[PDB]
Write an enzyme that holds these catalytic residues in place. Sequence first.
Site, PDB file in Angstrom:
ATOM      1  N   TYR B  58       0.826  -1.203   0.000  1.00 36.74           N
ATOM      2  CA  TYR B  58       0.000   0.000   0.000  1.00 36.74           C
ATOM      3  C   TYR B  58       0.861   1.253   0.000  1.00 36.74           C
ATOM      4  N   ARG B  68       3.504  10.911  -9.341  1.00 41.87           N
ATOM      5  CA  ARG B  68       2.727  11.443 -10.454  1.00 41.87           C
ATOM      6  C   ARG B  68       1.838  12.598 -10.011  1.00 41.87           C
ATOM      7  N   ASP B  72       1.971  16.381 -11.491  1.00 43.69           N
ATOM      8  CA  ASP B  72       0.821  17.207 -11.841  1.00 43.69           C
ATOM      9  C   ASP B  72       0.857  18.536 -11.101  1.00 43.69           C
ATOM     10  N   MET B  76       1.032  22.168 -12.875  1.00 43.47           N
ATOM     11  CA  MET B  76       0.038  23.199 -12.611  1.00 43.47           C
ATOM     12  C   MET B  76       0.675  24.474 -12.092  1.00 43.47           C
ATOM     13  N   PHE B 100      -5.334  18.971 -13.171  1.00 40.57           N
ATOM     14  CA  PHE B 100      -5.758  19.236 -11.797  1.00 40.57           C
ATOM     15  C   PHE B 100      -6.757  18.195 -11.305  1.00 40.57           C
ATOM     16  N   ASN B 121      -2.578  -0.955   8.144  1.00 37.41           N
ATOM     17  CA  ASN B 121      -2.391  -2.375   7.882  1.00 37.41           C
ATOM     18  C   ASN B 121      -1.115  -2.889   8.529  1.00 37.41           C
ATOM     19  N   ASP B 132      -2.949 -11.465  12.737  1.00 39.13           N
ATOM     20  CA  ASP B 132      -3.257 -10.953  11.411  1.00 39.13           C
ATOM     21  C   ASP B 132      -4.604 -10.250  11.479  1.00 39.13           C
ATOM     22  N   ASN B 139      -8.319  -8.263   2.933  1.00 35.95           N
ATOM     23  CA  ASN B 139      -7.317  -7.207   2.925  1.00 35.95           C
ATOM     24  C   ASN B 139      -6.475  -7.247   1.659  1.00 35.95           C
ATOM     25  N   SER B 142      -8.743  -5.900  -1.033  1.00 35.14           N
ATOM     26  CA  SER B 142      -8.855  -4.452  -0.930  1.00 35.14           C
ATOM     27  C   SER B 142      -7.621  -3.765  -1.494  1.00 35.14           C
ATOM     28  N   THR B 146      -7.501  -1.269  -4.804  1.00 38.56           N
ATOM     29  CA  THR B 146      -6.802   0.011  -4.871  1.00 38.56           C
ATOM     30  C   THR B 146      -5.817   0.032  -6.032  1.00 38.56           C
ATOM     31  N   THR B 198     -11.634   0.208  -0.424  1.00 36.91           N
ATOM     32  CA  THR B 198     -11.545   0.952   0.826  1.00 36.91           C
ATOM     33  C   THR B 198     -12.627   0.520   1.806  1.00 36.91           C
ATOM     34  N   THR B 201     -11.548  -2.751   3.277  1.00 35.25           N
ATOM     35  CA  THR B 201     -10.489  -2.618   4.270  1.00 35.25           C
ATOM     36  C   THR B 201     -10.994  -1.949   5.540  1.00 35.25           C
ATOM     37  N   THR B 208     -11.049  -6.281  12.988  1.00 35.46           N
ATOM     38  CA  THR B 208      -9.779  -6.634  13.610  1.00 35.46           C
ATOM     39  C   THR B 208      -9.597  -5.918  14.941  1.00 35.46           C
ATOM     40  N   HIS B 281     -16.481  15.171   3.407  1.00 36.59           N
ATOM     41  CA  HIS B 281     -15.817  15.544   4.650  1.00 36.59           C
ATOM     42  C   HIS B 281     -15.466  14.338   5.515  1.00 36.59           C
ATOM     43  N   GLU B 283     -14.452  11.493   4.484  1.00 39.33           N
ATOM     44  CA  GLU B 283     -13.222  10.998   3.891  1.00 39.33           C
ATOM     45  C   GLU B 283     -12.088  11.993   4.049  1.00 39.33           C
ATOM     46  N   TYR B 285     -11.789  13.305   7.125  1.00 35.96           N
ATOM     47  CA  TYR B 285     -11.397  12.847   8.449  1.00 35.96           C
ATOM     48  C   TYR B 285     -10.980  11.386   8.463  1.00 35.96           C
ATOM     49  N   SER B 296       0.093  10.530  18.021  1.00 36.49           N
ATOM     50  CA  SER B 296      -0.147  10.111  19.393  1.00 36.49           C
ATOM     51  C   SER B 296       0.879   9.091  19.857  1.00 36.49           C
ATOM     52  N   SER B 312      -8.948  11.829  27.048  1.00 37.09           N
ATOM     53  CA  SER B 312      -9.343  13.022  26.311  1.00 37.09           C
ATOM     54  C   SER B 312      -9.126  12.843  24.815  1.00 37.09           C
ATOM     55  N   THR B 356     -10.257  18.611  17.831  1.00 38.69           N
ATOM     56  CA  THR B 356      -8.943  18.667  17.202  1.00 38.69           C
ATOM     57  C   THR B 356      -7.989  19.564  17.979  1.00 38.69           C
ATOM     58  N   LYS B 359      -6.846  17.696  20.936  1.00 40.02           N
ATOM     59  CA  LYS B 359      -5.801  16.744  20.569  1.00 40.02           C
ATOM     60  C   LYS B 359      -4.458  17.437  20.375  1.00 40.02           C
ATOM     61  N   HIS B 416      -5.976  26.288   2.481  1.00 39.62           N
ATOM     62  CA  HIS B 416      -6.509  25.589   3.647  1.00 39.62           C
ATOM     63  C   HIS B 416      -6.301  24.089   3.544  1.00 39.62           C
ATOM     64  N   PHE B 417      -6.866  23.484   2.505  1.00 36.22           N
ATOM     65  CA  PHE B 417      -6.866  22.033   2.498  1.00 36.22           C
ATOM     66  C   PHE B 417      -5.504  21.464   2.147  1.00 36.22           C
ATOM     67  N   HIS B 418      -4.660  22.203   1.432  1.00 38.67           N
ATOM     68  CA  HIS B 418      -3.294  21.738   1.287  1.00 38.67           C
ATOM     69  C   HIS B 418      -2.479  21.946   2.547  1.00 38.67           C
TER      70      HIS B 418
HETATM   71  C1  HEO Z   1      -7.074  16.298   6.133  1.00 39.21           C
HETATM   72  C2  HEO Z   1      -8.261  16.701   5.676  1.00 39.21           C
HETATM   73  C3  HEO Z   1      -8.863  17.975   6.133  1.00 39.21           C
HETATM   74  C4  HEO Z   1      -9.077  18.340   7.446  1.00 39.21           C
HETATM   75  C5  HEO Z   1      -8.740  17.563   8.695  1.00 39.21           C
HETATM   76  C6  HEO Z   1      -9.666  19.602   7.437  1.00 39.21           C
HETATM   77  C7  HEO Z   1     -10.031  20.282   8.579  1.00 39.21           C
HETATM   78  C8  HEO Z   1     -10.938  21.336   8.541  1.00 39.21           C
HETATM   79  N1  HEO Z   1     -11.506  21.941   7.486  1.00 39.21           N
HETATM   80 FE1  HEO Z   1     -11.231  21.437   5.462  1.00 39.21          FE
HETATM   81  N2  HEO Z   1      -9.855  20.019   6.152  1.00 39.21           N
HETATM   82  C9  HEO Z   1      -9.358  19.040   5.333  1.00 39.21           C
HETATM   83  C10 HEO Z   1      -9.346  19.052   3.971  1.00 39.21           C
HETATM   84  C11 HEO Z   1     -10.310  19.782   3.276  1.00 39.21           C
HETATM   85  N3  HEO Z   1     -11.109  20.766   3.727  1.00 39.21           N
HETATM   86  C12 HEO Z   1     -11.874  21.156   2.703  1.00 39.21           C
HETATM   87  C13 HEO Z   1     -12.835  22.143   2.665  1.00 39.21           C
HETATM   88  C14 HEO Z   1     -13.195  22.880   3.766  1.00 39.21           C
HETATM   89  C15 HEO Z   1     -14.140  23.944   3.795  1.00 39.21           C
HETATM   90  C16 HEO Z   1     -14.984  24.609   2.730  1.00 39.21           C
HETATM   91  C17 HEO Z   1     -15.187  23.888   1.401  1.00 39.21           C
HETATM   92  C18 HEO Z   1     -15.390  24.922   0.326  1.00 39.21           C
HETATM   93  O1  HEO Z   1     -15.643  26.111   0.637  1.00 39.21           O
HETATM   94  O2  HEO Z   1     -15.305  24.590  -0.879  1.00 39.21           O
HETATM   95  C19 HEO Z   1     -14.193  24.382   5.068  1.00 39.21           C
HETATM   96  C20 HEO Z   1     -15.068  25.501   5.552  1.00 39.21           C
HETATM   97  C21 HEO Z   1     -13.311  23.619   5.846  1.00 39.21           C
HETATM   98  C22 HEO Z   1     -13.112  23.785   7.195  1.00 39.21           C
HETATM   99  C23 HEO Z   1     -12.317  22.907   7.929  1.00 39.21           C
HETATM  100  C24 HEO Z   1     -12.288  22.961   9.344  1.00 39.21           C
HETATM  101  C25 HEO Z   1     -13.054  23.912  10.218  1.00 39.21           C
HETATM  102  C26 HEO Z   1     -11.433  22.000   9.765  1.00 39.21           C
HETATM  103  C27 HEO Z   1     -11.104  21.677  11.169  1.00 39.21           C
HETATM  104  O3  HEO Z   1     -11.306  20.280  11.396  1.00 39.21           O
HETATM  105  C28 HEO Z   1      -9.674  22.038  11.538  1.00 39.21           C
HETATM  106  C29 HEO Z   1      -9.445  21.717  13.012  1.00 39.21           C
HETATM  107  C30 HEO Z   1      -8.060  22.131  13.440  1.00 39.21           C
HETATM  108  C31 HEO Z   1      -7.849  23.310  14.039  1.00 39.21           C
HETATM  109  C32 HEO Z   1      -8.993  24.244  14.301  1.00 39.21           C
HETATM  110  C33 HEO Z   1      -6.450  23.700  14.454  1.00 39.21           C
HETATM  111  C34 HEO Z   1      -6.106  22.984  15.753  1.00 39.21           C
HETATM  112  C35 HEO Z   1      -6.733  23.757  16.883  1.00 39.21           C
HETATM  113  C36 HEO Z   1      -6.078  24.706  17.566  1.00 39.21           C
HETATM  114  C37 HEO Z   1      -4.653  25.045  17.239  1.00 39.21           C
HETATM  115  C38 HEO Z   1      -6.789  25.437  18.679  1.00 39.21           C
HETATM  116  C39 HEO Z   1      -8.224  24.930  18.769  1.00 39.21           C
HETATM  117  C40 HEO Z   1      -9.130  26.000  19.321  1.00 39.21           C
HETATM  118  C41 HEO Z   1     -10.298  26.258  18.721  1.00 39.21           C
HETATM  119  C42 HEO Z   1     -10.706  25.480  17.508  1.00 39.21           C
HETATM  120  C43 HEO Z   1     -11.202  27.322  19.266  1.00 39.21           C
HETATM  121  N4  HEO Z   1     -12.691  22.710   5.037  1.00 39.21           N
HETATM  122  C44 HEO Z   1     -11.531  20.400   1.500  1.00 39.21           C
HETATM  123  C45 HEO Z   1     -12.179  20.542   0.150  1.00 39.21           C
HETATM  124  C46 HEO Z   1     -11.402  21.405  -0.829  1.00 39.21           C
HETATM  125  C47 HEO Z   1     -11.951  21.137  -2.208  1.00 39.21           C
HETATM  126  O4  HEO Z   1     -11.881  19.985  -2.696  1.00 39.21           O
HETATM  127  O5  HEO Z   1     -12.484  22.062  -2.864  1.00 39.21           O
HETATM  128  C48 HEO Z   1     -10.574  19.532   1.856  1.00 39.21           C
HETATM  129  C49 HEO Z   1      -9.877  18.521   0.984  1.00 39.21           C
HETATM  130  C1  HEM Z   2       3.114  19.205  -1.964  1.00 44.67           C
HETATM  131  C2  HEM Z   2       2.584  18.689  -3.065  1.00 44.67           C
HETATM  132  C3  HEM Z   2       1.414  19.335  -3.671  1.00 44.67           C
HETATM  133  C4  HEM Z   2       1.369  20.499  -4.374  1.00 44.67           C
HETATM  134  C5  HEM Z   2       2.527  21.408  -4.693  1.00 44.67           C
HETATM  135  C6  HEM Z   2       0.020  20.701  -4.755  1.00 44.67           C
HETATM  136  C7  HEM Z   2      -0.370  21.818  -5.501  1.00 44.67           C
HETATM  137  C8  HEM Z   2      -1.640  21.932  -6.026  1.00 44.67           C
HETATM  138  C9  HEM Z   2      -2.048  22.889  -6.971  1.00 44.67           C
HETATM  139  C10 HEM Z   2      -1.193  23.966  -7.579  1.00 44.67           C
HETATM  140  C11 HEM Z   2      -3.358  22.674  -7.236  1.00 44.67           C
HETATM  141  C12 HEM Z   2      -4.212  23.463  -8.186  1.00 44.67           C
HETATM  142  C13 HEM Z   2      -4.962  24.542  -7.407  1.00 44.67           C
HETATM  143  C14 HEM Z   2      -5.797  25.341  -8.367  1.00 44.67           C
HETATM  144  O1  HEM Z   2      -5.251  26.125  -9.172  1.00 44.67           O
HETATM  145  O2  HEM Z   2      -7.040  25.214  -8.365  1.00 44.67           O
HETATM  146  C15 HEM Z   2      -3.777  21.580  -6.465  1.00 44.67           C
HETATM  147  C16 HEM Z   2      -5.051  21.077  -6.478  1.00 44.67           C
HETATM  148  C17 HEM Z   2      -5.425  20.074  -5.600  1.00 44.67           C
HETATM  149  N1  HEM Z   2      -4.658  19.346  -4.780  1.00 44.67           N
HETATM  150 FE1  HEM Z   2      -2.813  19.520  -4.595  1.00 44.67          FE
HETATM  151  N2  HEM Z   2      -0.739  19.694  -4.305  1.00 44.67           N
HETATM  152  C18 HEM Z   2       0.032  18.822  -3.638  1.00 44.67           C
HETATM  153  C19 HEM Z   2      -0.310  17.637  -2.992  1.00 44.67           C
HETATM  154  C20 HEM Z   2      -1.627  17.314  -2.728  1.00 44.67           C
HETATM  155  C21 HEM Z   2      -2.061  16.405  -1.758  1.00 44.67           C
HETATM  156  C22 HEM Z   2      -1.152  15.616  -0.854  1.00 44.67           C
HETATM  157  C23 HEM Z   2      -3.446  16.384  -1.810  1.00 44.67           C
HETATM  158  C24 HEM Z   2      -4.388  15.596  -0.997  1.00 44.67           C
HETATM  159  C25 HEM Z   2      -4.229  14.300  -0.769  1.00 44.67           C
HETATM  160  C26 HEM Z   2      -3.836  17.294  -2.822  1.00 44.67           C
HETATM  161  C27 HEM Z   2      -5.133  17.544  -3.167  1.00 44.67           C
HETATM  162  C28 HEM Z   2      -5.459  18.494  -4.127  1.00 44.67           C
HETATM  163  C29 HEM Z   2      -6.843  18.678  -4.555  1.00 44.67           C
HETATM  164  C30 HEM Z   2      -8.040  17.916  -4.059  1.00 44.67           C
HETATM  165  C31 HEM Z   2      -6.819  19.659  -5.471  1.00 44.67           C
HETATM  166  C32 HEM Z   2      -7.987  20.229  -6.221  1.00 44.67           C
HETATM  167  C33 HEM Z   2      -8.290  19.331  -7.412  1.00 44.67           C
HETATM  168  C34 HEM Z   2      -9.426  19.934  -8.185  1.00 44.67           C
HETATM  169  O3  HEM Z   2      -9.617  21.168  -8.161  1.00 44.67           O
HETATM  170  O4  HEM Z   2     -10.174  19.193  -8.856  1.00 44.67           O
HETATM  171  N3  HEM Z   2      -2.711  17.847  -3.361  1.00 44.67           N
HETATM  172  N4  HEM Z   2      -2.710  21.135  -5.730  1.00 44.67           N
HETATM  173  C1  LIG Z   3      -4.546  13.521 -16.585  1.00 45.46           C
HETATM  174  O1  LIG Z   3      -3.148  13.479 -16.292  1.00 45.46           O
HETATM  175  C2  LIG Z   3      -2.463  14.215 -17.203  1.00 45.46           C
HETATM  176  O2  LIG Z   3      -2.990  14.859 -18.106  1.00 45.46           O
HETATM  177  C3  LIG Z   3      -1.148  14.208 -17.051  1.00 45.46           C
HETATM  178  S1  LIG Z   3      -0.111  14.922 -18.017  1.00 45.46           S
HETATM  179  C4  LIG Z   3       1.229  14.447 -17.224  1.00 45.46           C
HETATM  180  C5  LIG Z   3       2.508  14.695 -17.479  1.00 45.46           C
HETATM  181  C6  LIG Z   3       3.498  14.193 -16.652  1.00 45.46           C
HETATM  182  C7  LIG Z   3       3.112  13.412 -15.587  1.00 45.46           C
HETATM  183  N1  LIG Z   3       4.034  12.918 -14.781  1.00 45.46           N
HETATM  184  O3  LIG Z   3       5.367  13.187 -15.050  1.00 45.46           O
HETATM  185  O4  LIG Z   3       3.634  12.116 -13.756  1.00 45.46           O
HETATM  186  C8  LIG Z   3       1.763  13.190 -15.363  1.00 45.46           C
HETATM  187  C9  LIG Z   3       0.839  13.701 -16.175  1.00 45.46           C
HETATM  188  C10 LIG Z   3      -0.497  13.561 -16.089  1.00 45.46           C
HETATM  189  O5  LIG Z   3      -1.113  12.848 -15.108  1.00 45.46           O
HETATM  190 CU   LIG Z   4     -14.870  19.663   5.371  1.00 49.22          CU
END
Ligand code: HEO
Ligand code: HEM
Ligand SMILES: COC(=O)c1sc2ccc([N+](=O)[O-])cc2c1O
Ligand SMILES: [Cu+2]
Lengths: 183, 657, 96, 261
Positions: B58, B68, B72, B76, B100, B121, B132, B139, B142, B146, B198, B201, B208, B281, B283, B285, B296, B312, B356, B359, B416-418
């Site tokens: 895995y 790859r 990408d 980008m 993208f 795993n 196991d 497993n 699964s 993938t 997934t 698994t 398990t 969301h 997925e 978490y 941890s 806690s 969070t 934690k 944010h999400f990156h």
């Molecule tokens: C690893 C995955 C991951 C995780 C864990 C989080 C965690 C969180 N995310 Fe995000 N996110 C993730 C990955 C994404 N989020 C997204 C999208 C997304 C969106 C909007 C989607 C949109 O507008 O299109 C919101 C509002 C949030 C909020 C949050 C919040 C509040 C948390 C919270 O769980 C964070 C909790 C952690 C905190 C807060 C810091 C630790 C706390 C401290 C330091 C002190 C705590 C005290 C207080 C909180 C008072 N997320 C998207 C979609 C993007 C896309 O595809 O377009 C992805 C992939």
């Molecule tokens: C450090 C390596 C990475 C870089 C530099 C990177 C950079 C980027 C960039 C430039 C975009 C395009 C943003 C835009 O113009 O809209 C993007 C999109 C995205 N990346 Fe990454 N990324 C990385 C790794 C990851 C990882 C580890 C994840 C999650 C597992 C991830 C999830 C995504 C997603 C979900 C999108 C949006 C795809 C979409 O719009 O359809 N990336 N990333």
């Molecule tokens: C839909 O995906 C694509 O159009 C493309 S183009 C391109 C060029 C280079 C690499 N690379 O070096 O891993 C990947 C990809 C990729 O995934």
């Molecule tokens: Cu979310």
Amino acid sequence: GGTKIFGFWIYLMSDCILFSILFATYAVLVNGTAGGPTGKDIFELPFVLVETFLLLFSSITYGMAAIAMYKNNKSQVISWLALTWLFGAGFIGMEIYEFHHLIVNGMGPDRSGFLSAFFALVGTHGLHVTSGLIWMAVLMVQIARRGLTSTNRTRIMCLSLFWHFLDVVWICVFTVVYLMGAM
Amino acid sequence: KLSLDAVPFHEPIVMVTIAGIILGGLALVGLITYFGKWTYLWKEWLTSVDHKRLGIMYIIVAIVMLLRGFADAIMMRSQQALASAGEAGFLPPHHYDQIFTAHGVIMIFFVAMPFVIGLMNLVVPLQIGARDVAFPFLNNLSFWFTVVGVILVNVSLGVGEFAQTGWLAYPPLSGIEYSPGVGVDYWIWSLQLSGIGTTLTGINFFVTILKMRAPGMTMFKMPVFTWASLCANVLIIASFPILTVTVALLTLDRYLGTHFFTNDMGGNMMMYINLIWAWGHPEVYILILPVFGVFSEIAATFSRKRLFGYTSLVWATVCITVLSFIVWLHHFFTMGAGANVNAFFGITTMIIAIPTGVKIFNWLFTMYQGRIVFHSAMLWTIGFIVTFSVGGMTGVLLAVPGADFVLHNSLFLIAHFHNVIIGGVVFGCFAGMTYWWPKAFGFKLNETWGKRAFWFWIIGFFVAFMPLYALGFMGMTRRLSQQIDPQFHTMLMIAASGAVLIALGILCLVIQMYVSIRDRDQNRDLTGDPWGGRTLEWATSSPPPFYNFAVVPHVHERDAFWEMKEKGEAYKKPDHYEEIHMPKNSGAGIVIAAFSTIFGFAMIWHIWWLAIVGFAGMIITWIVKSFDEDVDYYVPVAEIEKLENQHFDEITKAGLK
Amino acid sequence: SVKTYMTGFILSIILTVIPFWMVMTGAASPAVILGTILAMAVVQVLVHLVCFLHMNTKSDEGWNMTAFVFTVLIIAILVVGSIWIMWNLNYNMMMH
Amino acid sequence: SGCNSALLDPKGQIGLEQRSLILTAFGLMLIVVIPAILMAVGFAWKYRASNKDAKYSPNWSHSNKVEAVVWTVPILIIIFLAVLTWKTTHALEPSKPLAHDEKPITIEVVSMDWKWFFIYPEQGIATVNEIAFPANTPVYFKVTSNSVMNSFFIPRLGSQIYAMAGMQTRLHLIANEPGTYDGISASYSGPGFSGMKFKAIATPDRAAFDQWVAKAKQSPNTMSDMAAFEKLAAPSEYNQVEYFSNVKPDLFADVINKFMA
Ligand code: HEO
Ligand code: HEM
Ligand SMILES: COC(=O)c1sc2ccc([N+](=O)[O-])cc2c1O
Ligand SMILES: [Cu+2]
Ligand SMILES: CCCCCCCC/C=C/CCCCCCCC(=O)OC[C@H](COP(=O)(O)OCCN)OC(=O)CCCCCCC/C=C/CCCCCCCC
Ligand SMILES: CCCCCCCC/C=C\CCCCCCCC(=O)O[C@H](COC(=O)CCCCCCC/C=C/CCCCCCCC)COP(=O)(O)OCCN
């Protein structure tokens, strides 16, 4: 042993989530009729009643098969399993009959969103029942070949969980789509 | 009939170099495996029902797909650097959209998910003192599902295209009328098969953890990483059915012309956004909960201190699991729902932020008054705390619907999400890889190159996504490809440097792996317990035996192995080793996934005969495996005696106990 | 379990017939009908669970009642939240 | 977080309120995040492993004061955030009529393949990739889509509301200052999505807006029928600003009814 049964129960919970998602889609798109069937004019509730009776009979016959599996009697387990398979095959062929009648007319899944959601939910339950029927045929063959061995008793319990879960899902289907569809 | 296949692969464009180098490199391994071991790679790997080998595979797939996905990302980032300042980039829109969407799909489903599932795993059966997983053949199947998804996505880079719709393929653009190409079919079928894998698994690990725990290890004496894995598997089981149903509905829309998500014939295209985020969301978490467990352990292991808030942390993880299903709408605030729904889901998304934070403070108070040894994994943990705090802060800033109205799809969301993935799942997967590398291969990863990779990764991420926060505040939206506003050129040319620094970091990680394998005979983790240790996984040889425990531990305490070391009952040779029952390696999964690669591909291209003989192939191989009866073997006592004698003599060559 | 299964057979037959007769023949306002069909469906599901599925709290050291309770809570959350979100959206998607 | 960035220097009342909300949330989450990072690095150096002056207290797992604080302060912060979020969500909902003295200018927005279409129903204007409206005058956008989902976003003015085929969303935006504000599609729609960039000219007063309306009325082409809309709806990526003198009286309704039938 019981770990396989517990894991299949958890998978049935995952399928409960799957069916809940399909139910949400149906509830969203039930009024998404586009100048076509409104549900009340296609469901034909006597069909649903006889189908629900058929699937309940299948569940009861499988329960009899399970209680006969607790006893060490290979023959009656196979007999009740064949009866359950016959009931399920009637269920599936009756839903293929209904789906054919809808499809031949213009009232297919592509006709409107409501019909697409109806087809998704009911044909997904139908595909679950058909997979359970294939599983039941394979389990009958394996029981005939090897008897009520430990592996086959676990499979009997797992397929019992699957079949009764499908019956529960059909309870929710005929209540939600078929009955509420006809007020 | 080859049906829709035809033979335009990618000839008009130069992406057949990569397709040219992925088949050449394959040829290379095809030679390399030929000039060496092929029956080993089939008998031991590629058919294994052993959780350790399947987790390692895995993680190997996760790294390979990370290369790859990062390619990408680099393409980008260079396209966005070039398009700003005016010059037309080297990527047209039709290819940038594929890039993208494939970056998002490869990273979420084939980098982040396989890495976390592989860590679970490899570790969870060891931590709970289990021989196991509950369902070993499930497993293996699964893992190979993938792999089917990975192969379908990589083939999309060859014959055909990948979806030009975004990594979640929003329904109106991903419909058959607006996306007639096979890209969304590749997306649909790779995601369906990976989702099946997934879900299986998740069932495997849930059962398990619940059933196959060691006798005496109650659920609150369980390692925290196992708690995080259990919660993540609960999320998998309760969420990936949503993804399966949503992608099946999209499949029906694109194949049978149904109207679930079409905009014309009563279809409601918003219900896909509701559903795809209903799984979206959870997925999110599914990815961040296990790595929490990974920290941890690594904290409690590298602070020489018992983990602070065990109860806690466990209850915070359970609360996160419960609340992750009540937050989805925070991903489509701007879709237009009323103020009550948006406000309610924003409130729940901010509520799911207190566990969070609890934690994070539990980890940084586990560091309180401890002996913090700055091993590579500990550096990854400190980096994770630092960047994940920022990422969660920005996410909560987005959780408020008022802010999300003006920040919904800006580069602030991308940042944010990156931030929460790169500083979360990626940092935790590299931390877990370095932490459990001795517990999987016996060697210890080169700490120098590990520290170099960590520094490059954290600095490059910070100098690559903070510019994206600024761009999100400047109004730059997701997925812009051509003619970017030159107002955005400076931040995009600073993010290009950050992507280059992350490239250097991945290069440092590759060099680390190469030097560790080259220097395998040094740093050989003889005792099978490097860097202290606090869980049952460290009570085994550095490569654990295939049974991984000759006698299942009794685990009277929470921090079992640390308590056994303090009590002095650490390494005891038992009087007798009984024959123990092991699952037998089965290649059926290979066949129940080879016909899965056919069926998917023969469904992507409308090759109905081949799709039917791939689906029939899968189901018939499943029936045949069902008819199989000799799926177990009792390992002889001689083998157990020999392995345990080797391990205990190695312990004797150190402080014997 | 034969007695239990036959009691389930009788209870499920008398719980499926009643809603079908209510819907077919009317005999109630189209508010009593919905309530009674929903209630009979819930009771029939409970019967199929407790009787045919042998669902009990003690089985599997818990985690069988716990698993179903959590799964039905997630089903309720997903379905109710999806219906509420989509209803509010569709109201907000109208020409009004 | 640029000083002159679109969001942290907004020219619209909705934008100003959203910027205030963003700043308040940023600070109130910083008073708990800055301690987290500062302790992550301090606890790390201070306790270290080399530092021998540290307390090195192992097996110190539970503490009621520490756990009480760590479950208290984030709960208080999130309670304040939730109250503020409810208030600001019910105040900043895009469908709220902004409660302004001036009569709102209705603009019916139709996203197209890779262009924006704007029907002024009371003015009679139609425009492509350009809007104008008086400064300090409410603007009521009835936003829909013609092909796929988009997001009608003016970063310097406020909310970005999703445009959806067959569905009318409402967005009230008012520009407190005159000037040309860039607007974009904030949801990816296809190959030409990068070219769905329009301009919003917040005219200094009603006179300049009326002059712009008259200039648009001085357009040889019209939108009298649905065939003209369909010709305009043909796929084109980087459209130029184009005006149409008069429109079908309920073109926007007909555009939506293309899908609702
Ligand atoms: C690893 C995955 C991951 C995780 C864990 C989080 C965690 C969180 N995310 Fe995000 N996110 C993730 C990955 C994404 N989020 C997204 C999208 C997304 C969106 C909007 C989607 C949109 O507008 O299109 C919101 C509002 C949030 C909020 C949050 C919040 C509040 C948390 C919270 O769980 C964070 C909790 C952690 C905190 C807060 C810091 C630790 C706390 C401290 C330091 C002190 C705590 C005290 C207080 C909180 C008072 N997320 C998207 C979609 C993007 C896309 O595809 O377009 C992805 C992939
Ligand atoms: C450090 C390596 C990475 C870089 C530099 C990177 C950079 C980027 C960039 C430039 C975009 C395009 C943003 C835009 O113009 O809209 C993007 C999109 C995205 N990346 Fe990454 N990324 C990385 C790794 C990851 C990882 C580890 C994840 C999650 C597992 C991830 C999830 C995504 C997603 C979900 C999108 C949006 C795809 C979409 O719009 O359809 N990336 N990333
Ligand atoms: C839909 O995906 C694509 O159009 C493309 S183009 C391109 C060029 C280079 C690499 N690379 O070096 O891993 C990947 C990809 C990729 O995934
Ligand atoms: Cu979310
Ligand atoms: C050309 C054919 C066309 C058919 C069209 C109709 C659809 C048919 C679908 C059939 C799917 C497969 C059904 C099950 C066959 C296999 C049964 C089986 O192996 O039973 C035993 C098996 C293993 O037992 P063990 O003791 O662990 O075995 C140890 C040694 N291996 O028991 C199990 O627990 C397996 C349970 C299988 C459940 C199958 C559930 C299928 C669910 C389908 C969902 C469909 C959703 C809707 C979308 C469909 C696609 C559009
Ligand atoms: C057409 C749409 C796209 C999808 C097409 C493919 C559909 C699915 C095809 C089959 C995939 C799943 C194969 C399952 C193989 C057997 C699983 C199983 O029973 O596992 C048991 C374990 O016991 C169990 O019963 C496992 C837990 C319960 C699992 C039940 C679900 C299994 C998967 C069913 C199909 C799920 C997806 C259906 C389609 C959904 C919609 C796309 C055996 O493993 P061991 O414990 O090692 O035992 C010895 C083996 N020699």
